[PDB]
Amino acid sequence: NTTYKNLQHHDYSTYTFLDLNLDLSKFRMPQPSSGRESPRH
Amino acid sequence: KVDDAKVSPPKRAEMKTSMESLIHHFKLYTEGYQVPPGATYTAIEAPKGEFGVY
Amino acid sequence: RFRGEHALRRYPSGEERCIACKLCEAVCPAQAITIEAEPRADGSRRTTRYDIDMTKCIY
């Protein structure tokens, strides 16, 4: 076999990374805190 | 002179044109060269005789 | 190399050669140098009063 099995890479636009990052928001651990919301509140 | 710009203020090209000799020149004329402690003596044969300095 | 007049120089078509860096007052063996210094507003650093005691100069 000498056949290329990407070209799913071809159709990539600009915002697609954060598009996917929004697409994969849920089923996520509860983001453990460090006391407050920030070291300066 | 000696091979020490920490005691002898070095010559002009390295004094100017160089940073380390400018620094040693400056602090050598202001502070004076540091001297280790102690009490010494010497004496030479001056034409008057035993010139001693303590 | 004869050491007489204690005169000043200046730059080629230029300003006054001194800086008021006080090295001469720092090393003068009679404290015959007295340099009271202020900068002028032009940015180039200057003096007020440059003083040599010709009485006190050991040359």
Add this chain to the structure above:
Amino acid sequence: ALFVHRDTPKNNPETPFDFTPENYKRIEAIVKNYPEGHKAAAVLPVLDLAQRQNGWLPISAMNKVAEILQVPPMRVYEVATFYTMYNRKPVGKYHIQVCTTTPCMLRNSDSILEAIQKKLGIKVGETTPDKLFTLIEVECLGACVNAPMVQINDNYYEDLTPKDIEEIIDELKAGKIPKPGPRSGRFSCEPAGGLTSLTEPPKGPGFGVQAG
């Protein structure tokens, strides 16, 4: 070079700056990945989004980020000056980055720079009096086994030659964006001659496992 701001309007806030509420939802995903206590850790992805939204970032973009991310603005200035993506100065729509340091120049980057220079006309490290053809030369990208290589915004161009340089430049002058893949064989990381690496179709999950 030139790390004084030198205000000169098109800067000096208020310069009008904005995002999309859809991009605000992107920013909510961005500060949804990071845990509580370190809300300021998303400075790098949010300012990456700012370069994605505007081809060069002005001062009011940094001011808007300093509003949003509860950050002191000087750290935003530091990260904007520090790295290499964030061209705070205006460039073309497409931006040309010629990667050439150690393997690339040792594999004849001279003809590549010649072809770019006497094809585009403007010089290295400079701009052009139009868009989409502003050029700098750059350090390594990673694809070292190929020719001294070309990068445009989020695309590569690998394994070239000065006539293919001129052809891809002419296609960009026509606006027809070329293929993202390389030219002249080895579409993947191939030994382009004998191909003495793996050839057989692999076993997969077939071989011997231990203590199942």
Add this chain to the structure above:
Amino acid sequence: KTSFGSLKDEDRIFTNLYGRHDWRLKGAQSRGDWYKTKEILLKGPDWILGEVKTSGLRGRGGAGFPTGLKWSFMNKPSDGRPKYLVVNADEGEPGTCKDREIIRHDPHKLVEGCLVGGRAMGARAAYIYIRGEFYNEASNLQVAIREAYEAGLIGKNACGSGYDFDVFVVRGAGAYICGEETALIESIEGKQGKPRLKPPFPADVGVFGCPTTVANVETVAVSPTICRRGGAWFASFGRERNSGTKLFNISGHVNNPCTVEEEMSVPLKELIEKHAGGVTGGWDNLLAVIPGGSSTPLIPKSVCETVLMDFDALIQAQTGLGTAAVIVMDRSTDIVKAIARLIEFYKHESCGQCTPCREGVDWMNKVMARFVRGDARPAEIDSLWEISKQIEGHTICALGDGAAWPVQGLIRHFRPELEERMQRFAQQHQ
């Protein structure tokens, strides 16, 4: 024993490096990932650690430090703070082509290995730093993690087990210094990427105040294959200590430059002449070899004709064997100008925490430019040898050291050619 081993098929670590059969969760399933895996993951993590230390896995990424002992110190009992696994994905030391292709074609074995490492030491999630120059392969990785999450495979209660694990990927703002260990830590933080002090470890205090660990793509990708195979199989290739497999990747002055997987020990000349064509113009055409990366001194022809490719052999060659830039160079070319281009790379990429790397790299750049023009005296060139000895062991990160060492190799080997350039300019002004 063998003749220090050679690659025979089915002992390759992973196929489909370049363009081949499949790329999907179905593709990794057909290639042997997510196979017999959860029973191993629930068998006990210290068994996995014993498998890793049985393999004798030498540390990747140019470090060479034992990964098994590192993760065994990372088997500390828990605190009131999480534990993070960080994966470096930068191809520095130009000449590299290390894992751009790995992240383009096999992401899911990295998913395997990072799940194994996260469950292996009580970790909780994995941050994966990619070079930001790789947006297409980055979105490919994003689609792969999308399919992996959406297949009900990992996430909270990965494979429905009693263990949660997630992977977050951070794009690069663009820096070779972010390829380092602790400058990566402050690049994640939101600061500028600059390291910290070493006796407070990132294994002690890493990502914001948690004991984390940082590993190469290669260690993570080779990890679950050893966990699914038998013990000491990686310790059965070539020598004993420096054993197993490695990417021998050659760019530069060779016919059809490329990348191969091989075993750990191989003759260099036969490695070159059998895999990527040969040497351009024959074996007697060339002049020298830089193995070990851009952080490594050069090797001349008369030595490299017989030196077998091994860690201990290149320690005896007094060179720092990193990874994947194991290339050659020809004879008629300005190696002075090429090494000067490498010093230009070093000056364009270093932070300014430590004074001496900044100062020494600028001095070496200006003085090597003078040596390209050939203007100075040989006392100055021996002074450059002196200061290239003097810079080393005075920094935070090893970039100053990797700037010092090629100057050392060039001075140790190509001294009369430098004398020739100086004589050229002396007779030119004369």
Add this chain to the structure above:
Amino acid sequence: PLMGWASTADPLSNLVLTFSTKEDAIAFAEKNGWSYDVEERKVPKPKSKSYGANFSWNKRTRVSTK
């Protein structure tokens, strides 16, 4: 009034004496008679500093730039 100097009628304004302990100072001042004001010697304070608490997890010590 002619040169602009520090014309002073103070012979004793240019002395400084180097001592080892405070007892030597008290004995010397009572030996040579004139009055003395002795200030107390104020040493520095050995203060605890630590890089880990400089870069900890949930405290307020966070330099945010280095």
Add this chain to the structure above:
Amino acid sequence: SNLIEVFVDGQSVMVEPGTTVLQACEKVGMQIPRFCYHERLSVAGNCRMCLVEIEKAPKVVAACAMPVMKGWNILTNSEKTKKAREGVMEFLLANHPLDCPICDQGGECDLQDQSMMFGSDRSRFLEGKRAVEDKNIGPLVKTIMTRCIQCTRCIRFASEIAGVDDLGTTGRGNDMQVGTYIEKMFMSELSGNIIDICPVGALTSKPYAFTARPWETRKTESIDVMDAVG
């Protein structure tokens, strides 16, 4: 229990846990030459002059922030200690221009004292010497950023104790400017404390600037006025 023994040049002394090598050396009296440490500021291992050799160690430990483990022995005056100090002093003195007369810290420099008592005397790297143009910080400070050795003492003190959060590092390599990027007039409280904490003549007093020099002035007792803190 609560006592850790270190052998400064053989001599044993008791050191509390959690403290640096430098507090032990000051406990026995040794001033390690230092530029970026401060005894009231947070510690960051930048200046590299704090190097010292502990035996059976190939690397050289930066003793500005090195913690003290069990039972040490330290060579303060080893040969490579002197080599490392001469080397770091040799590195610092290239990109610092010839300004010691027109500077304002003539008797009060730090490069000068430690270059006398630790460094070499015949410089190398005969050309180079980058020049960085300053900013307009404010009316209170005269600012020559060319003499800035980038020791990062103003930034740490500013952002922690002043909290003004405006001194920024811009760039990399030789081009690393300290200060606010957009030339904001640095006007805040305690903005006059910085002119002395800057260990080199990068920052100085605006009214005092070209008037006098510390070897002339005598030093005299006084207590703070207009404020009841003293």
